[PDB]
Amino acid sequence: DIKKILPHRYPFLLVDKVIYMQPNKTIIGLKQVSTNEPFFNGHFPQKQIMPGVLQIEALAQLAGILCLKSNNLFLFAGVDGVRWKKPVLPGDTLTMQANLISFKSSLGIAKLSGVGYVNGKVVINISEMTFALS
Amino acid sequence: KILPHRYPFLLVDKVIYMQPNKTIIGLKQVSTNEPFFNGHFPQKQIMPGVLQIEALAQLAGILCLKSDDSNLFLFAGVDGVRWKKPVLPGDTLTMQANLISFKSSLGIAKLSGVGYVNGKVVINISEMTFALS
Secondary structure, three states: OOOOOOOOOOOOOOOOOOEEEEEOOOEEEEEEEEOOOOOOOOOOOOOOOOOOHHHHHHHHHHHHHHHHOOOOOOEEEEEEEEEEOOOOHHHHHHHHEEEEEEEEHHHEEEHHHEEEEEEEEEEEEEEEEEEEEE | OOOOOOOOOOOEEEEEEEEOOOOOEEEEEEHHHHHHHHOOOOOOOOHHHHHHHHHHHHHHHHHHHOOOOOOOOOEEEEEEEEEEOOOOOOOEEEEEEEEOOOOEEOEEEEEEEEEEEOOOOEEEEEEEEEEEO
C-alpha cells in the first residue's frame, strides 16, 4: 500500500492491496477477511461476519483510490443501489472492483459503480457511489 | 431490551416514539468512546456515514419487528443515501424511519430514514430493504 494519502473517517483501511488499476476507468482490490478483524473492535460473535455497511466502506475506499489516481480531496457524499447477496465470513477473500462512471469537475462530482466477489460469486453490488468537492 | 444485530454495536441509545406499521423515532448520543472511534488517531473525530446508515438500519429493524405479529429481517439493500452534514462526538443524532412497504410475496420490507442533529438533517435515505430469514 502507498495509500495513507487516501482519506477515510472510518478508522481502518479495508483494502489489503490493489491488484489492478486502469486510471479514469477501473480498479480491482482485495481483502482477505481474517478472524482478527480490528473492525469488530475487540467485540465479537460465535459467527463473526463483515457487516454489509463495511462492505460499502471498502468499495468506497477502493473507488476513492481510483479517483485519487485520475489538491484533490474527495468526500463520500452519497451511495445508491446497494444489494447484499451473501454474507462475508472470516476466511473469505473479498475481491472488489470499482468502475469510474463520470467525473465532472464542473460541479466536482464523481460517480462510481462497485461489485464485491467471494470465490467467484457476487456478494454485493453497488449501482452508484458519489464523491466530491473536498 | 435487545434483538437481531449483525453489526456488533447497537447504534441506537433510545427509542422515543413508535407507531406499528408506520414510523419510529430514536436517538443516539455520539460519544468519544464509541467503538468505531477508536481504531485510528485522527485530528478530528467524525462519525462515518456508513455507520449512520447502520444506525438507521437498526432503528428501522426495530420498527419491522414491532410491526410483525408472528420471521427474521436481514438488511438486504439500501438506496438513495445522502450525507448532508458531519456528525461529531457530542452530537445527538435523532433518527426517524417510516414503513414504506411490506411485500409478502417478494418477502421484503422497505423503509425510508432521516437523521438530524439539532433539528437539521444530516442524512437522508430514500429506501432500506429488509429480507425475511
